[PDB]
Symmetry: D2
Subunit: 327 residues, 4 copies
């Protein structure tokens, strides 16, 4: 028996006795992701470039891709009827859903992540996190400011060589590969577990001059092992979604620590760090700032940043013990 994304969420929803609202919300993400995937893959681009003449639009319009993604995501989510608040990376303010379309779920998302790789055609993706609304108050920003630990579902779509959607929930992590011939995601990996230990480390070493001594020491150790084993390989694609997926699936460690340009980290906590930390923990892995668990942080700004270290438990831990040794 083959399992499709659609069927899988449905089955899970019954097991959990849902009213179906969260299930429709998930079905809606899928749609969004398929629509983004098709755009990213450049289908229909011959029109932009004149295959039918440059007479095609009467006035002004073409779209950047992340603008489009954002529109797809927002619009599909509202149409779901499952949400009351949304937080996009592209909006200075939480969007609040009209009462007619208002469900009970808060959704944080990065509609298109890894934009310095968009032009060079490198892997890019979409990041999401779902919360249940925890107040009887009219829906506002505060509803989005919960710790990642209160997540009900999270995950990401990866537009790589193929398109994959990874979904994490209370019971674990599942991967579905998009079949673009029939528009259906297919469970291809079930209940995924990251290796305890890894052989790849992933960090942008260009900030070498600004790392703290923990990260400096750890990096040396990945390259000149004290036990004299083979040094870790290094991979940094530059798209968080890509680097984290490879981390999930081959194991190892991903790092985006604090900097002078950012002393608080670069990556966003609501819609980059959190969901990626939820996925890592559901899969037997760790996600820390160096000092504490990403999921336990209570945000104050929807666009707050945080340092993030995630990956195999022995690897992350090894770095936590350096921070400890140092403090």
């Amino acid at each position: 028996n083959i399992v499709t994304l659609t069927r899988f969420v449905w089955e899970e929803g019954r097991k959990a006795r849902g009213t179906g609202e969260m299930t429709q919300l998930l079905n809606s993400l899928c749609t969004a992701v398929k629509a983004i995937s098709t755009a990213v893959r450049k289908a229909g681009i011959a029109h932009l470039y004149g295959i039918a003449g440059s007479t095609n639009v009467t006035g002004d319009q073409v779209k950047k891709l992340d603008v489009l993604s954002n529109d797809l995501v927002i619009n599909v989510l509202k149409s779901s009827f499952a949400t009351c608040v949304l937080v996009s990376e592209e909006d200075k303010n939480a969007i609040i859903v009209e009462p007619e379309k208002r469900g009970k779920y808060v959704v944080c998302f990065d509609p298109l992540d890894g934009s310095s790789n968009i032009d060079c055609l490198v892997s890019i993706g979409t990041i999401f996190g779902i919360y249940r609304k925890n107040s009887t108050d009219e829906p506002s920003e505060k509803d989005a400011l919960q710790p990642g630990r209160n997540l009900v579902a999270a995950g990401y779509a990866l537009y790589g060589s193929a398109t994959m959607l990874v979904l994490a929930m209370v019971n674990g992590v599942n991967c579905f590969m998009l079949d673009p011939a029939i528009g259906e995601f297919i469970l291809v990996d079930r209940d995924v577990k990251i290796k305890k230990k890894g052989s790849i480390y992933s960090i942008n070493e260009g900030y070498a001059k600004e790392f703290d001594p923990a990260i400096t020491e750890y990096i040396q150790r990945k390259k000149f092992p004290p036990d004299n084993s083979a040094p870790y390989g290094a991979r940094y694609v530059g798209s968080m979604v890509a680097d984290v997926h490879r981390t999930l699936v081959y194991g190892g460690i991903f790092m985006y620590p604090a900097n002078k340009k950012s002393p608080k980290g670069k990556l966003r906590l609501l819609y980059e760090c959190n969901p990626m930390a939820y996925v890592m923990e559901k899969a037997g892995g760790l996600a820390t700032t160096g000092k504490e668990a990403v999921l336990d942080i209570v945000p104050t700004d929807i666009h707050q940043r945080a340092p993030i270290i995630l990956g195999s438990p022995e690897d992350v831990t090894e770095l936590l013990e350096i921070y400890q040794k140092h403090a």
Copy 2:
């Protein structure tokens, strides 16, 4: 006035006064590339997972994406009628073409490069180079041992967020985007030129402990600019096709130098290094082992390796100077 790959090749053929044999060869390759693209993006994956039933099969028994790619290329090329010898990464020996199907061209390719990335869905590609056959004697392996300087055409397809075909000939480098809705590459970037100086460096820093002193000095300068300029950023996807493409388009440098466990470099001369050296030079860049232009090596074995450093002219030149300083 939209220019598709087929038209462009056709015209370039006219200007060259071609017999039309090479043009057909290139048309053939486009077709191989669109076919691999669809396979890589997993159209019809649902059949492999029993959508239609017939579910005994999913086991370690069926054709890998890398093997499929190879077959597509060999067959689509032979069917061209323009080739007499092919070299593939995936075969110990050059394939001699059937006298009946024979043509003058010699083709070296890597049907699918970046196979450490395959399972994690990161970008992967196809690299190729085309030579004119030098001797009059029967077609034999040694027809492929010609230095890169002799390349009549060379380039690659990147399967990334989108699929792209980059093609370099005597008079420049051009980029064509695959519109998978119609099966057609659209020229999106004409006569491409790499910038003189980038701000990104690409290398696997995990081999730090095997690096020669110049590579070592070089990295340091990128991190701690002795002149106080901004430090370069780092990127290493792990797929040559992707790292190189980014280098073409954003500028900067890409390096797979010799190291102790790879005393000759790891990347293959005939179908990885030469193809990308040719693109880089046709685009105003450099490609060097550290002591010598890659294109000038006289090859001695079809699977020979070479150290390769390629990218923007100023960034390669700076490194070469370091190499000179280490006499």
Copy 3:
């Protein structure tokens, strides 16, 4: 707000307070239909024809299309968990679903209809009818033998110039167009109503010599109107699904009356006539044998045939009154 098939069935299901089982069953048809559509449209056919060599399958296998369709349909339905009995046109016996996968719904279907048009590439389609199981007995054939009037949902997919899925239920008829770029059906026509009267008649006149006098008289009247208006146009595609859809959407009348080769009609009652009659009545139209309503017939053979006349009410009626005038 755009409505997708998925969302539409969901919304309807809640309104009707379903446990969701019938809703998953519908979601499962969709999938099946997308999969059939992609096959029919010939995607991936380059493999059959050797694009990768004729070395591709080790032993014996390619599939006819209606065989495939059948496998898709059966397998997707079982996987739904919504069914206990299925009746395919391709199976001499009702399939009975294993108790582990056994839902409460009986499904009758023609997996691929219009097969004399398959080779000439004319429009083809899939026909379905859903019943609720009406016994507390272990599920057997008798569960499929209900009159069309006990239908809970029915409809068809059309693989024409575009692919459309038409769905009828207690409350009416809705059309969704397949967007093959993102694999999603889009409500494009809502609550469809056939015209009271039409200007097209549709019958295979080649059986002229064997019609009864009712049909003979009616045909003359469509061609030499007694009121002297313009004669109806004639259309017979040869695929029931195509002729009936055009009937639904432009109005008029479709006929496949009794014959000597068939004195009982050609078309099958469980999975051709019934669903097509349910769709016609939900849309303000009529479906008769000449003597009685198709939906009211209680079948005795799952593969029983019946005469069928359907289309605009004034048109069908005009023919009923000829039968009456004659009897």
Copy 4:
């Protein structure tokens, strides 16, 4: 050994000693055909219905499939560099090509035929014919008034259950299936020949009351064979492209004779009748007005109509005899 349309055209070009101008012309058409196909099958229809938002628009304001088709064809042909005059169904006057873009070929086409079928999703097609330019004077409309006998190439694309391109030249008719997964037509039927005698007749029987006596006699014989043979079956899709294709492949006859409200027939000479007459004759069939081979008419107006009867040689001959018997 798989043969794609591009290869086939290329070779036929070699054998013909072509300049390669006509070959490019045909390549261009393939590209137009794949583009219309995608549009007809409704990829990206979700955008027209506000998936991405921007929902003011769906109203009677945006480009019809028929207009889009026309633009694709004109532009893709002009970009060929092989044409000096085009005739389209959709334009009152021939389009003269810009001297800069000029070539020797004259092209008559029907970008989208069967528009009464468009809304019901029944098959529709694109018909074309190519002439060599006869005079030396400036390119003008009258360059298109050449009898069909002069056609250098002719054929059509059928958008049906699958998309097909049928192409007839001096040395035969071949059929190529579009694999929309890779954007490539595959030759599936080589040197096609219509059978001598079919058992299907195609006509709009609704015009019975305007039919000339021979057509009338003819129909009767198909229904009541005076020799007691089996009666022919009837089929009339309503789209010339589909009815004709079926005629090519199953055999039999297709008829649009003159009738009183269409005293000259309805179908257009330059871009409907000639293109299909040429295919039929190159395939061993006949095409006649009833008194004269269609290809021999000297046309006098680019939108002139003609009565046309085409199909198997025995079935056309039988009808012609009836016409002779009516002196």
